[PDB]
Amino acid sequence: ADQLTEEQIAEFKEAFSLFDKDGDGTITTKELGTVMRSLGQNPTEAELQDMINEVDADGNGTIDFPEFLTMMARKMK
């Protein structure tokens, strides 16, 4: 996954679209938190709120398209 490709970009967009529930073009703690809970996984909406508060470039408390596409390409083969 280290090398970029069509799949990769499309992958980021897909994942992004899934999180942006309100569909405002950005992801929020509540938006993701809901997705994390509905899935039945760690509903620690607190952990995210804290993590987002950090990666948040504008400090708006939301994750933009680029950030997600980046923080996801950090590792994982």
Binding site: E14, L18, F19, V35, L39, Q41, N42, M51, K75
Partner: peptide
């Protein structure tokens, strides 16, 4: 320490899992 990346990846994996299944 770490855990942020895992949470992000775990959510994506589960999110897609639901997408493939087509549930809800």
């Amino acid at each position: 320490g770490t855990g942020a990346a895992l949470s992000w990846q775990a959510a994506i994996d589960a999110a897609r899992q639901a997408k493939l299944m087509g549930s809800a």
